[PDB]
Structures are given as structure tokens and as C-alpha cells.
Amino acid sequence: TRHLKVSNCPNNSYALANVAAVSPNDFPNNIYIIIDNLFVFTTRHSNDIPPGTIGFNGNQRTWGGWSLNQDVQAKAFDLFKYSGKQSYLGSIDIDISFRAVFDQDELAKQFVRCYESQIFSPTQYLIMEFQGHFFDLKIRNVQAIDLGDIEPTSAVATGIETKGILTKQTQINFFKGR
Ligand SMILES: *[C@H]1CC(=O)N(CC)C1=O
Ligand SMILES: *[C@H]1CC(=O)N(CC)C1=O
């Protein structure tokens, strides 16, 4: 369990990849970590981030309710341990809007391309680039499933407690924001 200070990470290599920028000596690269017992992100090493700090873009900070320099608690995250079999995303509904032509199929491809294997949960706020434009994505709801079942046993979830891994078979539903 690490204690890290939140810093802004606007560089597009990170800001568009929806990752938690960490120092190589705080966490290994590309693993799941959970912040403040609620927010799960995939890690990404950065040599330009002070050991003891963790970088997030504006949307991720808004989601966690973290202000700059705010101390935060981070721990390696084990999805199985957390939710057992109901660990994969069967579907995910996203509220999408232009950052401060609507193609559902293309937006979905880009989403899987950029975030496959990442964990998502309702309420999660992230930034995604699509054909030269930046968009704010808010995960509205999720449908967690056990890949072993021919159909979901659980209902569509709206709470941040339900977390699931994005796969190439996850149905992605976008909603032209407001
Ligand atoms: C966050 C992580 C990183 O290395 N950068 C570039 C300076 C960020 O924006
Ligand atoms: C966002 C979109 C994408 O494909 N990447 C890298 C694989 C991003 O960072």
C-alpha cells in the first residue's frame, strides 16, 4: 500500500491512454491498482514522474475527487479477489461529448483499441481521442458477466462498486452527450 501525491499529467502519451502514471519504483508497469479503495486504473511507468507521486489527467482527478498534491492511497488490485467470476464486461454504456459525425461502430472500435484489458466501472470519467478530437467519456453503466455463463446472471450496474475488464467482445453503447 503506497501513499502518493496527485499531479497533473497532460502529456497525450498518458492523458489519452486512461492510465495512472507512476514511478518505476512505486509500482510495476501495466498492472491494476486501486486508489482510495474505490478507483481502479492500469499503471504506466514514467521516468518524468517523482517517486511518491501519481499522475492523472483532469478527468481522472475529477472522477476521484482529487485536487493537485492531494495525498492518496494506492494498492495493487486483484479483480478476481474483488468480484470473483463476475469480472468481465459484457457491455458498457458511455456518455460521450466534445471536450470543453457520430459513428457508434467507429467510436466503439477506438475504445477497444485504446483500452482493451482495462478495468472500468460506472461513474468513471475518462478522456478519449477520436479522429483528431478529444472527448469526455463518462461510464454510465456496466453489465458485469462471468465469461463462463451463456448469459449474465447479474443486472446492469450503475454503482462504482461493480468493476469489469474490457474485452474485444464487450458491447459498447455510446450516447451523444446532452
Ligand atoms: C504525466 C506523466 C509524464 O511523464 N508526463 C509528461 C511530462 C505527464 O504529463
Ligand atoms: C488511446 C488510443 C490508443 O489506441 N492508444 C494507445 C494504444 C491510446 O493511448
From Swiss-Prot:
Comment field (misc): Present with 5920 molecules/cell in log phase SD medium.
GO cellular component, one term: mating projection tip
Annotated S-S bridges: none
Cited function: Required for vesicle-mediated transport. Catalyzes the fusion of transport vesicles within the Golgi cisternae. Is also required for transport from the endoplasmic reticulum to the Golgi stack. Seems to function as a fusion protein required for the delivery of cargo proteins to all compartments of the Golgi stack independent of vesicle origin.
One term of GO molecular function: phosphatidic acid binding
Domain of life from the UniProt record: Eukaryota
Family recorded in the similarity comment: Belongs to the AAA ATPase family.
UniProt protein name: Vesicular-fusion protein SEC18
Annotated signal sequence range: none
Quaternary structure annotation from Swiss-Prot or TrEMBL: Homohexamer. Binds to SEC17.
Full-length numbering of the shown residues: 26 to 210 of 758
UniProt keyword annotations, A-Z: ATP-binding, Cytoplasm, ER-Golgi transport, Nucleotide-binding, Phosphoprotein, Protein transport, Repeat, Transport
UniProt GO BP: autophagosome assembly; endoplasmic reticulum to Golgi vesicle-mediated transport; Golgi to plasma membrane protein transport; inter-Golgi cisterna vesicle-mediated transport; intra-Golgi vesicle-mediated transport; macroautophagy; SNARE complex disassembly; vacuole fusion, non-autophagic
Subcellular location: Cytoplasm
Primary location recorded for the protein, binned into one broad class: cytoplasm
